[PDB]
């Protein structure tokens, strides 16, 4: 069965919109789950003794919009009070209430599809024995799929995927590759090189396909405790070419960080 809402009801009986249907619609538009909120203090809450007065705060919890207009919440002294919005749809006249609790007791209850009381923490209010010392809001989470954006400003951090690979390149050379965002690679050299000539392909393992660059990458390395250096070429085909001077039977410790991009302009 298909239940339609944002459509013409010719007889004003067909597609009435329920509060839970708008709740789900709003949750979907903003990308919120039952474990977060949308919250805005239009005016600052006021702290008086062991109380927080929400002067004009709007909240969206489980896609349900409500306003706190001079609504006071009594607090526990010398405590971290977790302020919750509680939604009980069976309390038809007053479905929303606020509580100050000892822990974040957000329960993720699906009030739009099932029974139960939704509890969602939106504020953290710390008190002394006499009043409020600090207030910190709960993070408003946006769960999104694919974003097309022109410009972005990040005040915190972006967490991108990370892949690692250790290559025993041969001749005693070891590469430890870290790839981030599937593009930027930082190669850390380890081991000690011996029995190699300039221009020669190293005798060991070739770089795995996911770490291979589109174009040849020359990575500069250094010989530990010396004023001498080398470079290796990571070829698009996966092979590694030695471009330092010829090395004899005695291995010299190889170290250093080199970076490259896997992707070119495309």
């Amino acid at each position: 069965t298909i239940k339609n809402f944002t459509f013409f009801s010719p007889n004003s009986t067909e597609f009435p919109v329920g509060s839970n249907n708008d709740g789900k619609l709003y949750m979907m538009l903003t990308g919120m789950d039952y474990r977060t909120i949308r919250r805005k203090d239009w005016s600052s809450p006021l702290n008086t003794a062991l109380n927080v007065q929400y002067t004009n705060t709007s909240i969206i919890a489980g896609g349900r919009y409500f306003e706190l207009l001079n609504e006071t919440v009594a607090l526990k002294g010398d405590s971290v009070n977790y302020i919750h919005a509680n939604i009980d749809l069976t309390q038809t006249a007053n479905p929303v209430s606020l509580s100050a609790e000892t822990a974040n007791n957000s329960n993720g209850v699906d009030i739009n599809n099932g029974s139960g009381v939704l509890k969602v923490c939106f504020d953290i209010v710390t008190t002394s024995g006499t009043g409020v010392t600090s207030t910190k809001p709960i993070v408003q989470t946006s769960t999104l799929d694919s974003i097309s954006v022109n410009d972005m400003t990040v005040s915190g951090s972006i967490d991108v995927p990370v892949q690692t690979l250790t290559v025993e390149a041969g001749n005693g050379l070891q590469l430890q590759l870290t790839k981030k965002n599937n593009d930027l690679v930082i190669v850390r050299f380890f081991g000690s090189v011996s029995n190699i000539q300039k221009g020669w392909n190293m005798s060991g393992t070739w770089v795995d396909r996911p770490f291979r660059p589109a174009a040849v990458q020359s990575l500069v390395g250094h010989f530990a405790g010396r004023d001498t250096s080398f470079h290796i070429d990571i070829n698009p085909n996966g092979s590694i070419t030695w471009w330092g001077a010829n090395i004899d039977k005695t291995p010299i410790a190889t170290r250093g960080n080199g970076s490259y991009f896997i992707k070119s302009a495309w």
Partner: nanobody
Amino acid sequence: VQLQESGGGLVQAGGSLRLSCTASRRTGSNWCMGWFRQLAGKEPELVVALNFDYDMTYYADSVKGRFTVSRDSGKNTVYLQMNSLKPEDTAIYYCAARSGGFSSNRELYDGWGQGTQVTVSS
């Protein structure tokens, strides 16, 4: 990855001869073009090679200062100018080409030729 093996035949000991090789395509970076030598039914071995991208040559100690490898424009053609020839040098010279620098291993070569026979008369 096809190969052409122009030049090669009969000449006297202490004389001079040449070898030509052209590859259809290049498999990637660190493009090395050269020749593998096979004397008296023994195992084939790389003797002369040129790193195209680096303009760096490799010659085995046994042929040093006697042989000279050259490149023709951007035609991906390699020439071996063999002067002061020896009877030991009588071998079957196959043309080898690869991406990834110089290597002793046969399998690592993307292009392998038919093989032109060198006969140094006495």
